[PDB]
Amino acid sequence: AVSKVYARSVYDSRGNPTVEVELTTEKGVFRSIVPSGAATGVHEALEMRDGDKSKWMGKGVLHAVKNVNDVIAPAFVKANIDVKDQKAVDDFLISLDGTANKSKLGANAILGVSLAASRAAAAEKNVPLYKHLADLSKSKTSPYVLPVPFLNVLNGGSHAGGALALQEFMIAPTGAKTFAEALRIGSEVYHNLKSLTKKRYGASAGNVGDEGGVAPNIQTAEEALDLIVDAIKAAGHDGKVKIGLDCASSEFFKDGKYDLDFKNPNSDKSKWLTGPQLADLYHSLMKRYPIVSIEDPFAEDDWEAWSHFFKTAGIQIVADDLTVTNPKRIATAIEKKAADALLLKVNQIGTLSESIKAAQDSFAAGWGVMVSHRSGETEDTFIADLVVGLRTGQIKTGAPARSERLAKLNQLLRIEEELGDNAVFAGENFHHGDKL
């Protein structure tokens, strides 16, 4: 039985306040922390901020925290909910909020309680969190699937200077035999990339962005990709490391066109690309580079552009701001045939049950599911267990630098170690990891 629900303000990887929740039962105290993205999708569940310009640059979470302590806590504890029944737990929270986008209590107030309950349930059942998550999601009993980690080793767009418009350049060691090996491989590539970057761009560029990847002033995507290839080759892993991209195109969508030079206040408008033109650009990058996944290639509501490209893409197309981990928007994407992979972010919807639901609807439509962190992370490692429990075979949780990233990757090492022979590495089959 839950005897107490408590929330407090803590700091995320960017040094901005966020909500941390603790749920107390006879098994102990279970903690969960909420992540925070930047320039979030317009359709994401509401992240509640104080707005007090004299406190935390106006990014305080006192209101959210109060909502947990003075609203959810007393009601939740009095309801005597069975934490093992995740659906009951989240129906109560959703019903207490009463709004569609959780704007009353705030998604960052609800999620904490939702996630902490699942940890309390796992302990009650005396099983590893990923096992309980698998039960909650009706995943295969075995074999468990270790995911291929897509490491954002090079940042562009809003996460760096230069003209480079694309936001994320990831490497995925699909050629590894185990997660431990993929992670080793990934770190080696990353160190080779950092040394090359400092040598060609200087110490300044050698420094890392919010997710731990290098952020040199790159001019073009081809320049970035060639650097990634050189790093892979230098590391000795050519043929075993693939590339993933997060274009975050909504960032440069203007007048039905895409400005690949949106960082230049004097960008040539005659050079802005239309949907079909931006699609051809991706094709040229795909033909020259080992790209196996492309996230948000088009705007969050530019459905026709997504559908056109999907006709000939030929590789995993991941929807992030387009779907915002929302089953209602996922249905639309499926009907319009806009993509075939969901970037799953629990804080984009607000509850674990809804997130699991988004994943099931995706798999049911033949889609892949890439579990993801947010640009603003914490020492919390929930998504590590979540990606194993959902057996997706793929996760995006940062570069192999900065511990809000390594915390998850290290957790995956412990899970793999613990699973022993009761597990397989997604490898080349990451897209359909759940079918493994």
Tell me the catalytic residues: 211, 345
To a second copy, the closest distance from the beta carbon of 154 in angstroms equals 12
The entry of Mg ion, a second copy, none that residue 320 binds, CB within 5 to 8 Å by partner kind: Mg ion
Binding to a second copy (CB under 8 A): which residues in 231-250? 236
**Per-residue contact string for residues 319-358; x = within reach of Mg ion by CB under 5 A:** -x--------------------------------------
- The answer to whether residues 45 and 347 touch, using CB atoms and an 8 Å cutoff, is yes
* 379's tokens: 């020492």
To a second copy, the closest distance from the beta carbon of 172 in angstroms equals 16
User: 57 or 79: whose CB is closer to a second copy?
Assistant: 57
Is residue 378 involved in binding a second copy (CB under 8 A)?
yes
User: 214 or 339: whose CB is closer to a second copy?
Assistant: 214
Is residue 190 involved in binding a second copy (CB under 8 A)?
yes
Burial of 240 (0-12, 13-18, 19+ CB in 10 A): buried
How many degrees, rounded to 5, is the angle at CA 381 between CA 41 and CA 143? Answer: 100
Q: Which residue is nearest to Mg ion (CB)?
A: 320
Is residue 52 involved in binding a second copy (CB under 8 A)?
no
Single-letter amino acid, residue 164: L
User: 94 or 399: whose CB is closer to Mg ion?
Assistant: 399
Stretch that binds Mg ion, among 105-113, 173-181, 189-197, 316-324 (CB under 5 A): 316-324
- Peptide bond before 147: cis, by omega within 30 degrees of 0? no
To a second copy, the closest distance from the beta carbon of 372 in angstroms equals 17
Contacts to a second copy by CB under 8 A: 8-17, 20, 54-57, 160-161, 183-184, 187-188, 190-191, 202-209, 212, 215-217, 236, 377-379, 399-404, 406-407, 409-410, 413-414, 417
Contacts to Mg ion by CB under 5 A: 246, 320
